[PDB]
């Protein structure tokens, strides 16, 4: 083709993900030392958000500035579909910016945008997956690799609801050959189709996956990860409804961390509902890496933007 | 004076419009070859939008980045008029940005902004005209000039409603000495005052204009252009109402294109209502140049911004 | 510490404020001569607005571009507090931008943001004070210093309501050793706590302050300053209610200016309600400096941003 | 291969030379309008001079600065050949600069440098030819094209000694399909091998060439070109010796220009020996373009450097 | 005209020299604070040296880099005059660099270069004067202004030979309205024509000048300045010859400084012959400012280059 | 202190040398990928050469351009010492450039320059040592580390004369904990004082050193290094004299390489005298890394310049 998209890590090999991590960490280190590599000079990113965002939006906008380009915030309601067709919007934006991202209510919207645009398209989260979160989370696990452990020998346990972030964490950990668990209650577990995709990743990678409601599954976790309980932006569970499903068994508290292990690190994509999926004590505690993880939303987005723009330039000399 | 505005092409000569085209195409060619001329370094554009926009807004914001400056999106509701007077807003913005554009509900708002501001002001569309569309459309017609034809010998036919874009296309084609037709139904034709202005342009240019409901008027068109049927943002015609006025006589379909001529190119400012003013077959067909035309919204805005900033610097050494 | 904030000028000495003025005016002069000092290259400012703004918002966004960085407009409703705690938002933004500003409904919000963020935080106005307005106003008074007068011998009279801008003007004038008066009606005067803070400033500076409803207080003013009468954004006084309190005694009209003195300059933070706190004749008259003052919102913000980023870099080598 | 050299225009087609002219003139026009295209950013040119130079050396050094790179002056005596072999010098410099030029006493030296270096090598003049002079001279003739004439219908007459510049002018004019004459005395005419190469160029181009001692050959010249009479830097003819050969028949004086034609333009590569090959009256006269021609040494070198670096980057992605 | 030269300060007013000082010191302060104003971006300076130089040459070359341009070192022997006429060299260089300087054996050479070039020409020292030294020395005296003294009330005494630097110091001090003395032995004093020029400066400035062999003339000097005794580069006095003329009466030693005054500062253009015109004790002593003075060769050259390029751009829009 | 010099690696620890290698290789990799880190923006390097140079001079000049600064070539004969004292030259240059290097005839000259200058001074080779060669050579050995070997287990054998490069190679290899041999004839071996310094390095590093005329010493070398036989620039041995001392025993030929080992790499600082210290077959052969080594003169100089400028900025905030 003449471009590459980042809609799902399912289209990336382990080697490509490692390259993305390595590129991201090199850029991070330069900036830490006071030097900003101008790798996207005069390039323009269209940023389409159908939902609210702090970390994803600010990461894209900051990343562009840091690398010498600019991000344009197209707020909820440039509509995807509607009166103007997605084919028209996609072809028009392909002439007016160099690269696109979109956070979408429905996954088909990002797929359609990628299919119809002739410039790189990045999924900034859908109801299905969250691939920039995957890369940031991988950067974070690499930086916080336990002493004497290979990445592939790490155990990553996601606690709670089968969110798009849960699935995405499963996708990236299995892609990298790691050991993944979704610890969640029946009715809120990764589904058969999700699990088939995790198995497919493991066939190649030698990693493992388990989906279970067994509380002992947290034992030996190197990373213990959670997310909110209220579901999707269009149809939230109420406090009473979600507490009924998840509390207290799926609350990440100090007792759960102690059971997972003394050096187990706590992760959360954020925003967090303190007192539901995680207690103040854990998220603010010595083993929380969620703020390093949030920083790495920017770390990973810088590397990804550069990778995709380099690919585009290679295909369009 | 100490600045120049771009409110209407009525204040520009043919020679100035050619200069704007030539400048725009030089910048376009540089960028096509991977080089971004930093002609607006550290300059700031205030972008006031009273209505939704994809092409105009993204073109301004991208243009500024590409040329080394920045565009600020001032969303619907910095009010023009209201509690704070237009004189105050204009004088204040003149101290805080280098150049302004505004897409306005009512033409007097852009006129007032231009009259009261001491920096260049650009009309990003009003209920009266659409002069940046004119320049982009002219760039497009120049690029797609038929073999063996001079620009002045081209025939440009606008089909349908007497929109501000219809009038603007009349203004630019007549300014350049071309042959213009508005093919539209009685009651929805360019009015007496519009036509007097077209005649005035032709007195100088030697071009021609005709406003007619004769379907044979499309015959021999080099460019066949249309726009939506629903009218102005504040007071849309319903689907039933606009179909009653315009359908099927004013639908640009393959039969109309065949009648216009085999090499006639289709143009539309966009967004398009597929199945009303144009069929899928035409807009997606081999003779459609509307996506090149959309790209040239950015092409023309880059040249215009540079022209106006150069003029400002010449007057304010 | 590892950063410095700009929440109130109460934490700045006279010498520091002079340094800020001098830095701001040097940058202004360079730009006047066509040279843009790239003092914030690749730096990112998060701009959180809980209320509407023309001058503050555009000043921050333009300042960043002029100095080689970028400002991100985070529109009303990234919430401060709410579902996601202020501690979380603050720590997250500290990883994703280099510097923050916020215009807040309630002062505690900016205090909390500053306390929880590890990057510099700037108050873009609260219900308590308006410190960037202070610096811009000081730059303006320095530029318009009366012939043969020291800054400290100037008399600055604020007319009307005890707005946050009124208090801020009191804070800066007393900090610089000048003579301040709030001329306002009983019930709408700077309160006991405000006045205690002004007295504290004067203990150090040798300046003076008076809060009074005596109309003779305007006599001998070098600067006569006013603001709107309708109160705070969340709870406005109606036209009838505010006219009943303030009109005509507190209307700045030509007669009041004549009484203050022939060379007294008129100031207003803007937006102004013409016909209430000021007449057209005064604000558009020969002794009005409110548009120079508005320009100096940008002048002062450039200097402040550079000062705070330099401080940050000094503390984080 | 992995690079391209500019040792002789014999390896360039007419289309490539036109491209070089067009690129050079676009860059010239940008700079005339105050804009410097940064097309060689951070690139380093090694400049090896075995002989003195004003125009060639300054053109290369200025060109690099203008385009965002740098030229290094390697003065007579980094030796080519000698104790360190040319193979070693060439391979070493290929690691330490991006592009090379050399003005050489003997043509084999530039050939050897080009053959052994893996970066582009440019001939800055040898005893055989002078290809950057060719391109500058072509740019000059294009700019000064007579009214109503095609380039190919122009007549270019070189007067005097069969210098490397004489031969080079023959090479470029015949490559472009023009009509060339060397008007020179027997014993000092382009030799049989030179003429065979001119005939070979004309076989492709349809141009013409003549080598003659007939004074009537100047009649109808559009460009009349000359050079010094003293021969090569290592073995100059004395004043008496060269006057005996060339004077007065080959002196370009006003009478010769009048005979050539009223609009014939005078060219000289410079430095000129006033009173020998040209009189003060001609070189300082209204029809002299030698200073425009000297400027175009820089014009052409900018275009060439960019062309060769672009070619290198295309071959080494 | 279309440019301005800097051949002698005789063509500059006191106000222009103050502007040059002020500009130079602003640039110096920026660089001291770590910021390099890019005021000469992509501009090229030709640097012609007929004599050796450390301070002048390095100052020009460094200044260009610091301000975003480049200086080209044209070493002794691009000849001025000779085989190629000065008119030709001047016109050719005017096409190939933006600005020129030259250090020349004979003053007429710099005059001829300035007269024939259409770009700014700067005198880098001749046998007559040294105007960049003047500006650097003035910057130095301003920075080291004695407490409680105006510039005009300062006494500047040059000791020793009537060098071009001696005369230049007389020219600048008298231009600025200061009090100048040349303390030198009969036969080696500023001549009648020099003194007539100093008187002419004083007619305008109200300054004073004296040329004398009275040793009491050093008393009350604020600045005591000297230079070498060996004369001009082409015809040096031997050690014995110059000692016979000048030693010990004109040796600046600690006794002379004590007599001049406790706060008198020692200046020397450098290079110095330690043990002749100055002792180690003085030049390395607490009251020596010659290294600050040497730094200000660069300070002044930066300001001058910018001033002349700005003037050129103003005249050639 | 307020700066750091690079006169000898004797003042650097193993950890510092590793840091220098790592920094150099990061910069090299960026440039290989088409990105030039602007780490020395607007910085000026004075380059003083008392002897001829290709690799050192071009490396410094190119390095400065690549990193956004500039190098000034001060050719043989700004004299160090002489009429103007070294103290004066050093103090003057400290005001006029940011960093200095010098290639000197006598080591005391670089020591004096470093001691008297207040800016970083780099030794570009003396009669004693060659520390930039050390760093380039170390970068080269790291890049060409044999499979399955640690740097410290490598054997490096220098063949021939006890040149400054021989000693320097001993210094760096022993500093890094490697195993060094000088294989050279009696009378031309590293002397007692050299060897005492190598022993001192080994006391810390655990490396080894041997100085011997035993031809079996080459056996097991991982790197086999040589240099010219003619001695120092001021007093060369003739061909007959040096052949008498060194030939054929110390000629690096294919037989010697075969004896050293099949994967032993050949190194030479260059220029090489082919047919003396090395045969064509070896230097042009598959195991020669001398051109990679020459490239790494630039690799190492980039890292060193950045390291020293960063150190300077840290000490002079
Ligand atoms: N399951 C959650 C996932 C939120 C991911 N968070 C982020 O990407 C951080 P942001 O929203 O601040 O960009 C949901 O559906 O809302
Ligand atoms: N008659 C139409 C004109 C739309 C012009 N379109 C554009 O300028 C493209 P945009 O809206 O995406 O900027 C109307 O009044 O709506
Ligand atoms: N008392 C007024 C203060 C307005 C200050 N104005 C500004 O800062 C100018 P802006 O709102 O355009 O940024 C109020 O509470 O509204
Ligand atoms: N036949 C002459 C050619 C000189 C060409 N001149 C130039 O290239 C101008 P320059 O020497 O100033 O670079 C000779 O052999 O000397
Ligand atoms: N009278 C002395 C003047 C030297 C001025 N010195 C300088 O300009 C310093 P520089 O030579 O290092 O540039 C002479 O004729 O030599
Ligand atoms: N022993 C040799 C060392 C030469 C080192 N070579 C280099 O540094 C390469 P260069 O001279 O090209 O910079 C001698 O004394 O000459
Ligand atoms: Ni922006
Ligand atoms: Ni240079």
Author numbering:
A (entry chain A), B (entry chain A), C (entry chain A), D (entry chain A), E (entry chain A), F (entry chain A): 0 to 76, 78 to 317
In the authors' words:
Transcarbamylases are the enzymes that carry out this work, by carbamylating an amine using as donor the carbamyl group of CP. Similarly, agmatine, the decarboxylated analogue of arginine, can be used as a fermentative source of ATP utilizing putrescine transcarbamylase (PTC) in this process. The subunit body presents the classical transcarbamylase fold, consisting of two domains of similar size and gross fold, the N-domain (PTC residues 1–130 and 301–315), and the C-domain (residues 131–296), corresponding respectively to the polar and equatorial domains of ATC and to the CP and ornithine domains of OTC. Each subunit has a characteristic shape consisting of a hemispheric subunit body and a projecting tail formed by a C-terminal helix (helix 13) that is a characteristic and exclusive PTC feature.
